[PDB]
Amino acid sequence: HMMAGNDSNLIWLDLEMTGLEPVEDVILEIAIIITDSELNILAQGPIFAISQTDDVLDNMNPWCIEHHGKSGLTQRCRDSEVSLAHATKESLAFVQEWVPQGKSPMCGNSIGQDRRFINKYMPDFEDHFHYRNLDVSTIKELAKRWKPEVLESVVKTGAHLALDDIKESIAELKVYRELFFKL
Amino acid sequence: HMMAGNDSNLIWLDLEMTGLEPVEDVILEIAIIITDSELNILAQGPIFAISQTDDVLDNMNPWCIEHHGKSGLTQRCRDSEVSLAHATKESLAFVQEWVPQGKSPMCGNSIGQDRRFINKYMPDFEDHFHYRNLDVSTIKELAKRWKPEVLESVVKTGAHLALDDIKESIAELKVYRELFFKL
Ligand SMILES: O=c1ccn([C@@H]2O[C@H](COP(=O)(O)O)[C@@H](O)[C@H]2O)c(=O)[nH]1
Ligand SMILES: O=c1ccn([C@@H]2O[C@H](COP(=O)(O)O)[C@@H](O)[C@H]2O)c(=O)[nH]1
Ligand SMILES: O=c1ccn([C@@H]2O[C@H](COP(=O)(O)O)[C@@H](O)[C@H]2O)c(=O)[nH]1
Ligand SMILES: O=c1ccn([C@@H]2O[C@H](COP(=O)(O)O)[C@@H](O)[C@H]2O)c(=O)[nH]1
Ligand SMILES: [Mn+2]
Ligand SMILES: [Mn+2]
C-alpha cells in the first residue's frame, strides 16, 4: 500500500471499560482506525471485546452494567475468548504496518482517559505512539466557546461501543476541519 | 475581577516534576493562570515550588538534575517549606474563586500528562475540573499536518518553569486562534 508507512498517518482509538479508574477497572472493548493526515479512513484494525469473568462483569459501576447490558457488550465479553495480551499483539501489529514509530499521536475524544488504561494494561502498544494526544474534545471545548453553531453539524450517536465511537470522533474532527479551521 | 465566576473561564496549568513517571516521580512546581473564554489573562494563581528533601532532589532523572539545577528550581524546592497539601488547598481555593466546579477543562500543552500527576497527588484539586482536557498540543499536531506555516508565528522559549511554560501555552493558542481557526 503506497500510503502505508506515510509519516503523517494517524492512529485513532476508543476503549470501553468497567469504569473510570485504572487501579480498579479493566478494558472491555477496543477498536482502531488509521486515517491519512486529511482524515480519509485508510484501514481498520481489530475490534476486540475482551474476556472478563462474571464477577468482574457483575461488579462494574451502575452506568456500566446498564449501558454495556443494553448494547450486547457484557454478553460479548462473556462469550469472547480473546485475551488482553492477544488483543494487544493483534492491536500493535495492525497499527505498525501503517505508521512509523513515534510519529502519530493517539487520536480520539478524551483520548487521555483511554491512554491511562493503555499505559498500564497495554504498555507496548502505547510505546508505538508519539507522547502527544490529538484530542478531538479539545476542539469541541474551543468550539463551544469560539463558534458554537458549528456544534449543530456534529453527529451525536447514542451508541457506546468502540467502532461506533471512534468513527464518530473522526467525523467530528471532519466537521471542524470544514467549518472551524481556516486551511 | 469582574469576570470571576463566569462559566466559560479556562483554568490553565503547568507542573514541573522529578520525571515522566507518576508511579515514582513527584511534583516540584505548579503554576495556574485563569483566562476568559477569549484568552485574556484574568488572574495569576500563587506559584509554588513544592518542598522536597535533598534525597528527592539529588536522585531525580538526569534531565531534571540539569534543567531544574540550571533554572533555580532545585534550589527553590530546597528552601521551600511548602507541602503539597498546602499547595493543593490554596490552588483549589484560587480556582473556586474564578470558575464553577466542573466547567473548565484542564488547559495547557500535553496537559493529559500533568493530569496524571494531579490525579494521583492532588485529587481534590482535580475534582474542580471538567473531565475534559484542552490540549494546545492537539492543535499543534493538527497545524503540523494541515497548515504547518502557522508554526512560524508560534513562540517557543527555553524556560521549563511552570509560569513561563503556561504563559507560552496561552500565547501559542492565541496564535492559532488568529491564524488557524475561522472565527
Ligand atoms: O457515565 C459514564 C460514562 C462512561 N463510563 C466509562 O467510560 C468508558 C468509555 O466510555 P465511552 O467511550 O462510552 O465514552 C465506558 O466503557 C465506561 O467504563 C462511565 O463509567 N460512566
Ligand atoms: O463523567 C465522565 C464521563 C465520561 N468520561 C470519559 O470521557 C470520554 C468521553 O469523551 P467526550 O467525547 O465526552 O469528551 C470517555 O473516554 C469516558 O470514559 C469521564 O472520564 N467522566
Ligand atoms: O526531556 C524531558 C522533558 C520533560 N521531563 C519532565 O516533565 C516535566 C514537565 O515538562 P515541561 O513543562 O518542562 O515541558 C519536567 O519537570 C520533567 O520532570 C523530563 O523529565 N525530561
Ligand atoms: O520527550 C518528551 C518531551 C516532553 N514530554 C512531555 O510533554 C510536555 C511538552 O508538551 P509539548 O508542548 O511538546 O506537547 C512536557 O510537559 C512533558 O511532560 C514527553 O513526554 N517527552
Ligand atoms: Mn471513549
Ligand atoms: Mn509542561
Numbering used by the authors:
A (entry chain B), B (entry chain A): -1 to 181
Paste lines from the article.
We also report the structure of two separate uridine-bound forms that mimic the product bound state of CpsORN. Furthermore, the structure of CpsORN bound to two separated uridines was determined to understand how the cleaved products interact with CpsORN. In this structure, two uridine mononucleotides are located in similar positions as the last two 3′-terminal nucleotides of the U-U complex structure. Both uridine molecules interact with the manganese ion. The O atom from the phosphate of U2 directly interacts with manganese, and the C3 atom of U1 is located near the manganese ion and the O atom of U2. Structural comparison between separated uridine-bound structure and unliganded-structure clearly shows a prominent difference in their flexible loop region. The His158 residue showed inward movement toward the active site to interact with the cleaved uridine phosphate, in the two-uridine complex structure. Thus, the His158 was suspected as an activator of the water molecule during the enzymatic reaction of CpsORN. In separated two-uridine-bound structure, manganese ion has a different interaction network compared with those of the U-U complex structure. In particular, the manganese ion forms a new interaction with the 3′-oxygen of the ribose in the U1 ribonucleotide.
Therefore, oligoribonucleases (ORN), RNases targeted toward short oligonucleotides, are needed for the complete digestion of short oligonucleotides into mononucleotides. Among these, ORN belongs to the DEDD superfamily, comprising 3′-5′ exonucleases that require a divalent cation for activity. Our research group have focused on the mechanism of action of oligoribonuclease (CpsORN) from the psychrophilic gram-negative bacterium Colwellia psychrerythraea strain 34H, to understand how the enzyme hydrolyses small nucleic acids. Structural analysis results show that CpsORN is a stable dimer and its active site is formed by swapping residues from the other subunit.
